[PDB]
Design a protein. Structure first.
Length: 344
């Protein structure tokens, strides 16, 4: 039974204690037993005006942010507040539907076996696995010919249209960030555009974190780094919870309305020879309100061999990561963090 979890939104309704499968060992808890989860992020806060990324001072801000945090907030990103609010409303609308309606999109293929795409939870591997306090709807967006539209919610009926339009807007953001990164690494503005390739990948993950009566005991999403090249994250109504690790310390990622958060993923850490790192991040829950986010994961095409860019290497700049085909990295990332296995 334990390999077929009931959605946390159901298990959380009205409870005053988290069920045992969500409770972390005391030393793993946010605050490690206590109620102080994270430190405020010190100034300067990493914020990048995406419309001015060709100005030298703005490019410098992007570089500083990537060296320091591996992530940054973006303003002037070209996405209407109306579209951001509507795509997150469509997500909320879906999660508020009855369990049996959402389960038509279940990622448990016969109610028993996990796959990534669909509505439900991440894979449960071992009965001792501590589960995260969240549900998610995860969908293949690109390459468009690999989509399985049977997993895309039909209600509200504008869900697909809104996701398609939003993702076309975050793809613009992806391209601007990647071009700025090729330039600052002196690899050519185009370098990462060519890396992701014609069949560049895009996955949409709608996260739903129910309120938790004991946020000191659980993770909304456990510490992790993302697997792709860059992630573009939208947090609905800027509800707090997202935290980033730097030097063993957990820092609150600040909220800014109508902004996006851009963070690097493991594929970029490999490609850029670890000059910038893929940041480890987590979500802590709260007692008062649900929290919703939409992560757009952008990665390289499946056949691309991930390796440190030749332009970053030389006699005194050895490769720090071993070569691996992108699809094999993602599979290995699924089944000690996985990117450490690639270090040489
Ligand atoms: C959830 S994740 O481990 O960050 C994550 C998982 C899979 C993918 C994605 O499907 C890609 C391709 O399909 C296969 C090659 C690698 C590439 O990454 C992404 N992505 O496109 O960014 C992220
Ligand atoms: O909900 C968030 O703010 C973070 C989501 C996240 O880390 C992920 O979906 O990989
Ligand atoms: Co993440």
């Amino acid at each position: 039974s334990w390999r077929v979890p009931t959605p946390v939104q159901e298990l959380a309704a009205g409870v005053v204690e988290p069920p045992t499968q969500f409770v972390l060992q005391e030393q793993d808890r946010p605050g490690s037993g206590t109620l102080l989860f994270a430190t405020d992020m010190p100034e300067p806060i990493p914020v990048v005006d995406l419309s001015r990324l060709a100005a030298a001072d703005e490019a410098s801000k992007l570089r500083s942010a990537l060296e320091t945090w591996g992530l940054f907030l973006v303003t002037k990103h070209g996405i209407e507040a109306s579209l951001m609010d509507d795509v997150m409303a469509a997500s909320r609308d879906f999660f508020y539907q009855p369990l049996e309606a959402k389960q038509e999109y279940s990622n448990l293929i016969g109610g028993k076996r996990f796959q990534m795409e669909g509505y439900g939870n991440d894979m449960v591997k071992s009965k001792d696995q501590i589960l995260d306090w969240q549900d998610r709807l995860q969908l293949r967006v690109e390459p468009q010919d690999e989509r399985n539209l049977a997993y895309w919610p039909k209600h509200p009926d504008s869900f697909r249209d809104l996701l398609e339009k939003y993702a076309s807007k975050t793809k613009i953001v992806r391209n601007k960030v990647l071009r700025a990164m090729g330039k600052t690494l002196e690899l050519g503005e185009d370098y990462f555009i060519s890396q992701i390739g014609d069949r560049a990948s895009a996955i949409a993950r709608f996260n739903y974190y129910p309120p938790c009566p004991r946020p000191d005991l659980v993770f909304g999403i456990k510490p992790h780094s993302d697997g792709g090249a860059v992630t573009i994250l939208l947090v609905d109504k800027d509800v707090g919870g997202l935290q980033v690790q730097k030097d063993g310390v957990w820092y609150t990622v600040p909220s800014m309305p109508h902004t996006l958060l851009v963070n690097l993923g493991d594929s970029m850490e490999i490609m850029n020879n670890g000059i910038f790192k893929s940041p480890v991040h987590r979500v802590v829950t709260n007692a008062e309100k649900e929290r919703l986010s939409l992560a757009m994961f952008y990665g390289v095409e499946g056949q691309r061999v991930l390796e440190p860019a030749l332009g970053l290497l030389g006699e005194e700049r050895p490769a720090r990561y071993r070569k691996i085909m992108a699809s094999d990295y993602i599979i290995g990332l699924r089944q000690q963090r996985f990117i450490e296995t690639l270090k040489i």
